[PDB]
Amino acid sequence: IIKEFMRFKVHMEGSVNGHEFEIEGEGEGRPYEGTQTAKLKVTKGGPLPFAWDILSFQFSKAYVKHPADIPDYLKLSFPEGFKWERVMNFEDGGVVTVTQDSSLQDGEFIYKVKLHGTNFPSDGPVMQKKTMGAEASSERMYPEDGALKGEIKVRLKLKDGGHYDAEVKTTYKAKKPVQLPGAYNANYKLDITSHNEDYTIVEQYERCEGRHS
């Protein structure tokens, strides 16, 4: 059962342009309201020599507000949970892939994330830490191959004005047969609410809701 108030624990193992790191975090939210907050700590390989923003999106689709007529496929997947795999193709050739496992243990969501980032130019906004958060985006959700798929055009803001984009494609798959919905949009807004100087401690907030096309 997905309660009104839920905590989660996350562990990420990653590598960006060869730089290895581990992140440990915890968060909380209101799964039926579509709101959540997380506190992330770089536990290995800190400080990171790249933009935190490429990581921010990988830290929770069980906290998406759904209208009653759209089956909440990823909430229904629990206690077993679900798995997701993502590819983010950046406009300057940088590529990120993420594999994730979500489960429910002792009344809390447990997230296990693996991330690879490569081919970011040495002089690009990611490696030069020139990003300044993300614009609100809309993910186009649609069923296919017995899984839920999502497509997003992510727009990262640049510190001196201007944008830095990526094409994001994700597959979300429940660990048991649970009701897949028809096509729809999930509107996101993700904010970095606070960080220390070298981004080794970061707090994020997110609000997401599913809407009919």
46 close to 146: Cβ distance less than 8 angstroms: no
Could you say which DSSP state residue 182 is in? -
Instruction: Encode 25-60: b = buried (16+ Cβ within 10 Å), e = exposed.
Output: bebbbebbebbbebbbebeebeebebbbbbbbbbbb
Tell me the one-letter amino acid at 192: I
Resolution in A: 2.1
The two structure tokens encoding residue 1:
């059962």
Structural domains counted in the chain: 1
CB 48 within 8 A of CB 199: yes
SS (H, E, C) 6-68: EEEEEEEEEEECCEEEEEEEEEEEECCCCEEEEEEEEEECCCCCCCCHHHHCCCCHHHCECCC
E strands in 45-162: 82-90, 95-105, 108-118, 131-134, 137-144, 147-158
Cα of first residue to Cα of last residue in the chain, in angstroms, is 28
Q: Token digits for 162? A: 């201007």
What single-letter DSSP state applies at residue 177? -
- Nearest-5° angle of CA 186, CA 202, CA 169? 30
Distance from C-alpha of 45 to C-alpha of 95, rounded to nearest angstrom: 20
Q: Could you tell me whether strands 163-174 and 184-195 are parallel, antiparallel, or unpaired per DSSP bridges?
A: unpaired
CATH number at residue 2: 2.40.155.10
Question: How far, in whole angstroms, is CA 137 from its chain's centroid?
Answer: 12
d(C-alpha 149, C-alpha 170), whole Å: 6
Distance, CA of 92 to CA of 90 (rounded, Å) = 6
* Cβ pair 125, 155 in contact under 8 A: no
Q: Look up residue 74 and give its DSSP letter.
A: H
One-letter identity of residue 194: S
Nearest CA to 132 out of 115, 114, 156 is that of 156
Cα dihedral sign for 41, 44, 49, 53?
negative
Minimal CA–CA distance to 103: which of 93, 95, 113, 94?
113
CA angle 5–24–194, rounded 5-degree value = 75
Domain interval for residue 34: 1-213
Q: How was this structure determined?
A: X-ray
Strand pairing report for 137-144 and 184-195 = antiparallel
Q: State how far Cα 180 lies from the chain centre.
A: 20
